RNA sequence: GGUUAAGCGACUAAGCGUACACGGUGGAUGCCCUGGCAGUCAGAGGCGAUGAAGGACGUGCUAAUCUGCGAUAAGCGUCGG
RNA sequence: CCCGGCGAGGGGAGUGAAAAAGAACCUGAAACCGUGUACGUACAAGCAGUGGGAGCACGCUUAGGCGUGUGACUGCGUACC
RNA sequence: GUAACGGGGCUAAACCAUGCACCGAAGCUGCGGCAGCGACGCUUAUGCGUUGUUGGGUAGGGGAGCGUUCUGUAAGCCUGCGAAGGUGUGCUGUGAGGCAUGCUGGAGGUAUCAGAAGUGCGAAUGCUGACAUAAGUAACGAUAAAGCGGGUGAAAAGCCCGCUCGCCGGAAGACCAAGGGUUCCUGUCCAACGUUAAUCGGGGCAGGGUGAGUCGACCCCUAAGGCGAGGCCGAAAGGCGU
């Protein structure tokens, strides 16, 4: 009773996992190099 | 008359299998069995199994004389795709597609 | 570097025009057993150029 | 609509469009823009013209 | 009193795509591009309905001029001579006569040449 | 008939385009409803130290998830249908 | 019953009004991906269309030519909000 | 990079003066059709005939319409002689549109005149699902290293035996407390999971396994600290303390 059931089952969990993987705080910008056209 | 054999939901991408299917389009059955034997591809096993199964059908269900059958039609098309997740650097995550295929072979005495 | 416009299916088809693989046609028959094999290779039942070999 | 007032994500920085509510009328499972209340459709007719 | 938009929108989309048969690439498969292609085609057709009336007159002039010099006269003198002789023949008819009947054209040319005198 | 010149020139598709026929993937559209929403007319407007609301662990021929029940544990006594 | 690894997936037989209703199971669109047929394409420069226009294939037809598909060559032409 | 006639080229195809022809626009004329605004006649309303004139258009004002879901007309009418839906073809209105019919579909649909709107989508770095491109490209997670024979198996570089080789050895060895909760052992299976294959596994399924007077909790005693009968304070909630 395994094959189709669990095989398709994992495709539901991947959606929520990718959904959570987007906490987005780790965005770490400030583009550390000097500003493009600074003062 | 025609005889069909199919392998649905085969674990391989459609593009890779289509390379093998081009060799045996329009050949005689004996030659096709010879060619697939001496080709080093994963897909060659699946196609050879399907072709042998198609040969068996044309003899037991339909008539006989396997000595003059030919490969009239053969084509490949996509099936459902399983989706999995694979982690990357800095907390990012990516989608992964595991593709399948449908294999059909048409053999006839014409 | 990334594309600026997605290439067409035509261009995808043109690039793949060299991906076709080739058959063998170099099938040879052994003198004694008469079975098929590649050139310069041992047959399945261990025969090479008629004379029996290891045949494990 | 049953939900919470937290912002979905910050204002700037990310590449997405600006959003401020999970229950916006333009989102799936959001609210209706001009919802309806129970009404009363009766009219008036003068005695003489009845 | 809720109204769904499926059938009507599908019909309206199918109406446009049926007008874009034969166009290249995505200009016959996706609505957003086929719409603009159809509008352009309409504009071009409207504009060309005017230009069609100029190219044919240009061609008729060229053929008449070529045929007239075979009989030793220029186009402008030929046309002017026809007017002094009171001849009303359409340029389309003149080109047709020039192609399909040499003798009649020669008669016309001689008449015009006499009319100039 | 032949031999020389000079001039002109059908037939190829590694692949690609458009049209038509037949398919695959995907799940819209139509048609359904013991699920909801808003109300009229009546009822009741509390439960608990005689241990509440809410729970834990148990309970079957078979072991569990729902539904009941409490070591008298998918049930015990009596009066009616 | 047959091929296959005492597989997965198929082809028969059988039930049913229907299996192209076969359990991922009413109907089943679009993007997207294929096989087959007809025409075009390897000296040619640009919003890819529009106005002219040979040739080829198929159907009707009594001539005479019509209808469908493709489209060599040529005039004009720098998307939408 | 010719490039200070658009080019080719030009001693007229250059520049003055005169003249007659012709080309040249959606301008004007010819033929056919539609719609306004007036005038004039018949019906003297509508219905008409004979005329004159008008019709590029953003912001914006005014006038007419098409189509979708629901209520009445409805126990009416159409429906296996095949409804809604899907997919082609052919006709006709100035337009939104309408009608007939082939194939799928297998049970509902609505003249006509009125009424009420969740009434029409291409854009909003719009929201949800599905599917493309880059591309069969980059990568397969420590440079401690592997070679051969036999076995099982449909299939063996990766599994099991054997020999040889290499690495760690104040650890990459043997234990305990935290934390986890059957991952432990045996037998079976390979469709998903294992960054490849797999007969293998911390994967699926079924059985089994944890024995205490002395080891540890529980128990007896208190530190920092907590609670706190009375008590003292405080709009209420409460705060501090014997």
Swiss-Prot record, chain B:
**Disulfide partners:** none
**Positions with a binding annotation for L-tryptophan:** 90
One GO BP annotation is:
cytoplasmic translation
The UniProt entry, under Gene3D superfamilies, shows: Ribosomal protein L22/L17 (3.90.470.10)
Q: Which UniProt keywords apply?
A: Antibiotic resistance, Ribonucleoprotein, Ribosomal protein, RNA-binding, rRNA-binding
Q: What InterPro entries does the record tag this protein with?
A: Ribosomal_uL22, Ribosomal_uL22_bac/chlpt-type, Ribosomal_uL22_bac/org-type, Ribosomal_uL22_CS, Ribosomal_uL22_sf
Pfam families reported for this sequence: Ribosomal_L22 (PF00237)
Question: Which molecular function terms from Gene Ontology are attached?
Answer: large ribosomal subunit rRNA binding; structural constituent of ribosome
What NCBIfam families does this protein's entry cite?
rplV_bact
Free-text function comment from the UniProt entry = This protein binds specifically to 23S rRNA; its binding is stimulated by other ribosomal proteins, e.g. uL4, bL17, and bL20. It is important during the early stages of 50S assembly. It makes multiple contacts with different domains of the 23S rRNA in the assembled 50S subunit and ribosome.
Q: What protein is this chain from?
A: Large ribosomal subunit protein uL22
Corresponding gene?
rplV
From Swiss-Prot, chain C:
- GO function terms (MF aspect): structural constituent of ribosome
The record's keywords, sorted A to Z, are: Ribonucleoprotein, Ribosomal protein
Q: Does the keyword NADP apply?
A: no
Q: Which Pfam families match?
A: Ribosomal_L32p
GO biological process per UniProt: cytoplasmic translation; response to radiation; response to reactive oxygen species; ribosomal large subunit assembly
**Keyword Ribonucleoprotein included in the entry's annotation:** yes
The domain of life for this entry's organism is Bacteria
Q: Gene Ontology terms, cellular component aspect?
A: cytoplasm; cytosol; cytosolic large ribosomal subunit
Question: By its UniProt entry, which SUPFAM superfamilies does this protein fall under?
Answer: Zn-binding ribosomal proteins (SSF57829)
Q: Where is this region: Disordered?
A: 1-37
Which family does this protein fall into? Belongs to the bacterial ribosomal protein bL32 family.
Q: Which NCBIfam families match?
A: rpmF_bact
How is the quaternary structure described? Part of the 50S ribosomal subunit. Contacts L17.
Protein name from the UniProt record:
Large ribosomal subunit protein bL32
Q: What is the lineage of its organism?
A: Bacteria, Pseudomonadati, Pseudomonadota, Gammaproteobacteria, Enterobacterales
Gene name, Swiss-Prot/TrEMBL:
rpmF
Swiss-Prot record, chain D:
Function recorded in the entry: One of the primary rRNA binding proteins, this protein initially binds near the 5'-end of the 23S rRNA. It is important during the early stages of 50S assembly. It makes multiple contacts with different domains of the 23S rRNA in the assembled 50S subunit and ribosome.
Q: How does it assemble?
A: Part of the 50S ribosomal subunit. In TnaC-stalled ribosomes forms part of the binding pocket for L-Trp with the leader peptide and uL22.
Keywords from the UniProt entry? Antibiotic resistance, Repressor, Ribonucleoprotein, Ribosomal protein, RNA-binding, rRNA-binding, Transcription, Transcription regulation, Transcription termination, Translation regulation
Q: Enumerate the Gene Ontology biological process terms.
A: cytoplasmic translation; DNA-templated transcription termination; negative regulation of cytoplasmic translation; negative regulation of DNA-templated transcription; negative regulation of translation; response to antibiotic; ribosome assembly; transcriptional attenuation
Phenotype for residue 12 to E: In strain: N282; confers erythromycin resistance. Ribosomes bind erythromycin poorly and have reduced peptidyltransferase activity
Remaining remarks: The erythromycin sensitive allele is dominant over the resistant allele.
Q: Which organism is it from?
A: Escherichia coli (strain K12)
Domain of life, per UniProt, equals: Bacteria
Cellular component terms (Gene Ontology):
cytoplasm; cytosol; cytosolic large ribosomal subunit; large ribosomal subunit
Q: What is this protein called?
A: Large ribosomal subunit protein uL4
Q: Where is this region: Disordered?
A: 1-20
Q: Which cysteines are joined by disulfide bonds?
A: none
From Swiss-Prot, chain E:
Q: Which domain of life is it from?
A: Bacteria
Q: Give yes or no: UniProt keyword rRNA-binding.
A: yes
GO BP: any one term? ribosomal large subunit assembly
- Per the UniProt record, one Pfam family is Ribosomal_L20
**What GO CC terms are in its UniProt record?**
cytoplasm; cytosol; cytosolic large ribosomal subunit
This entry's Gene Ontology molecular function terms read:
large ribosomal subunit rRNA binding; mRNA binding; mRNA regulatory element binding translation repressor activity; structural constituent of ribosome
Q: Which keywords accompany this UniProt record? A: Ribonucleoprotein, Ribosomal protein, RNA-binding, rRNA-binding
In which family does this protein belong, per the annotation? Belongs to the bacterial ribosomal protein bL20 family.
- Summary of subunit composition and partner proteins: Part of the 50S ribosomal subunit. Contacts L21.
**What does this protein's UniProt record list under function?**
One of the primary rRNA binding proteins, it binds close to the 5'-end of the 23S rRNA. It is important during the early stages of 50S assembly.
Q: What is this protein called?
A: Large ribosomal subunit protein bL20
Organism (species): Escherichia coli (strain K12)
